[PDB]
Design a protein around this ligand. Sequence first.
Ligand code: VO4
Length: 276
Amino acid sequence: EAIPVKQFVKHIGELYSNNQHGFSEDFEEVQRCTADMNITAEHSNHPENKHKNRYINILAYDHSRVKLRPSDYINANYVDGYNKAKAYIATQGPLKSTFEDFWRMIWEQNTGIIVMITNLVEKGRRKCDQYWPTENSEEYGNIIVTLKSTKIHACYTVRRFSIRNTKNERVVIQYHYTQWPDMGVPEYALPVLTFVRRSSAARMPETGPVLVHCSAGVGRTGTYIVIDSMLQQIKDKSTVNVLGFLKHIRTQRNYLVQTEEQYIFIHDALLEAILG
Ligand code: VO4
């Protein structure tokens, strides 16, 4: 049930009205929507991958999890884009003990772009281990990753890496969003629009899923995926279905778009885009 923009914009005023309870109501239904699908995640919970999960309750569904080739586990899922099956790999901030697994999946999965939407440390709390070399090279299993350049913008930074399996070379590019608030979401959807735009557009045409991560890899990660998917749907079709696309991707990884303030925020972003 795609709807045209006209009626999207025409009626969303409703959802924003009343302290936002409309959104709040659509989002609960979203909370309820995977409840009875007994969607398996036994690789996540298997006792000897326990320490590979940054958070004990944030898991990888079995059916869409990313398997490292032949100890094949990694807390990461394929998630669909807008007419691209498996457009993204949603993943948590890697840990010291998962850096190898993390770059191996990048190598193997052929991914060219990396979207990072957390700071390493936020408000005194650790969110993501530094999995890339701060300058020069560092080695993680069989992949040498090397920092070739850095560019810092107001709300995000671009690190261009060059990586190599030590058993061939690839330029990987990380877009790292750096001004996501301590609590909630940004105050202005604009800088996130521009971030989504440029990072989305760096996707070269014969490459693997774009890896997206934050801390748990669900919240801001999910919010990134809907904005960007809903934006392409709009260029191409002039329609949207934020609700029905959310319920589809929530079967591909748990809690995508963790909050209602984030859900709300997809909409500021999209509306701002439609009127920009
Ligand atoms: O770092 V999160 O996937 O809880 O937004």
